């Protein structure tokens, strides 16, 4: 929790920064945007192994889509796949890993103008994420114990799996556990409730719950707010 808390702040810092005028957290705390670090891992500069975690910042301008993306804007499939073959061992094709990666962060910015009203990071440990969503048992059952180099093929087909085949959300399968509570919440489609709160309630039990951070943007920097009374907007 001390960790995250750190963390919350080294993106709350860097948004407040770039406002003013996707990124990797390295073990050392310091903050790079990712396209960047990645051309400095391919010059021979950076280090992938120094990457301790991997932002993602959303930017809205509607409170519903906000409040959607703080409760259900979980990492791509691909990311956490990615991430757990490379945590594990396993390489994919001619791709560069991030095998000491621990925690996926997706900070969502709320707009009121041209001006910001509000930032919630929501912090995951990528461990915890790759278990709820099967991943192990996956990648054990296609490719064995064993560690080595994957084809993109061999990618593709455990991606298939974990997303489109298995119901992994009150029968659904992944991809359509996105989409129902969206037409819900953000559509504003009251005929979608019944589906939606299914998926709710298998998803808050089921799914780890992240440590999340919240703030209100407050004449030129943000200012630390309770989650729970932003929930209530």
Same mark, same amino acid.
């Given at each position: 929790?001390?960790?995250?808390?750190?963390?919350?702040?080294?993106?709350?810092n860097?948004?407040?920064?770039?406002?003013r005028?996707?990124?990797?957290?390295?073990?050392?705390?310091?903050?790079?945007?990712?396209?960047?670090?990645?051309?400095?891992?391919?010059?021979?500069?950076?280090?992938?192994?120094?990457?301790?975690?991997?932002?993602?910042?959303?930017?809205?301008?509607?409170?519903?889509?906000?409040?959607?993306?703080?409760?259900?804007?979980?990492?791509?499939?691909?990311?956490?796949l990615?991430?757990?073959?490379?945590?594990?061992?396993?390489?994919?094709?001619?791709?560069?890993?991030?095998p000491?990666?621990?925690?996926?962060?997706?900070?969502?910015?709320?707009?009121?103008?041209? =001006?910001?009203?509000?930032?919630?990071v929501? $912090?995951?440990?990528?461990?915890?994420?790759?278990? #709820? @969503? *099967? %991943? /192990?048992?996956?990648?054990?059952?296609?490719?064995?114990?064993?560690?080595?180099?994957?084809?993109?093929?061999?990618?593709?087909?455990?991606? =298939?799996?974990?997303?489109?085949?298995?119901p $992994?959300?009150?029968?659904?399968?992944?991809?359509? #556990? @996105? *989409? %129902? /509570?969206?037409?819900?919440?953000?559509?504003?489609?009251?005929?979608?409730?019944?589906?939606?709160?299914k998926?709710?309630?298998?998803?808050?039990?089921?799914?780890?719950?992240?440590?999340?951070?919240?703030?209100?943007?407050?004449?030129?920097?943000?200012?630390? %707010?309770?989650?729970?009374?932003?929930?209530?907007?």
């Amino acid at each position: 929790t001390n960790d995250e808390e750190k963390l919350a702040d080294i993106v709350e810092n860097e948004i407040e920064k770039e406002i003013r005028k996707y990124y990797y957290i390295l073990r050392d705390g310091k903050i790079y945007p990712a396209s960047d670090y990645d051309i400095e891992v391919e010059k021979g500069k950076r280090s992938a192994n120094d990457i301790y975690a991997f932002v993602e910042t959303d930017v809205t301008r509607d409170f519903d889509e906000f409040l959607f993306d703080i409760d259900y804007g979980l990492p791509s499939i691909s990311d956490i796949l990615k991430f757990y073959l490379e945590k594990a061992g396993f390489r994919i094709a001619n791709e560069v890993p991030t095998p000491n990666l621990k925690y996926y962060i997706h900070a969502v910015v709320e707009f009121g103008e041209d =001006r910001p009203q509000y930032l919630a990071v929501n $912090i995951y440990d990528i461990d915890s994420l790759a278990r #709820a @969503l *099967r %991943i /192990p048992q996956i990648v054990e059952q296609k490719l064995g114990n064993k560690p080595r180099t994957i084809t993109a093929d061999e990618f593709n087909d455990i991606e =298939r799996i974990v997303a489109e085949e298995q119901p $992994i959300l009150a029968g659904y399968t992944y991809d359509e #556990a @996105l *989409r %129902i /509570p969206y037409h819900y919440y953000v559509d504003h489609n009251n005929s979608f409730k019944d589906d939606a709160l299914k998926i709710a309630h298998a998803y808050l039990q089921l799914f780890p719950t992240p440590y999340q951070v919240c703030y209100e943007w407050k004449a030129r920097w943000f200012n630390k %707010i309770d989650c729970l009374k932003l929930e209530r907007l």
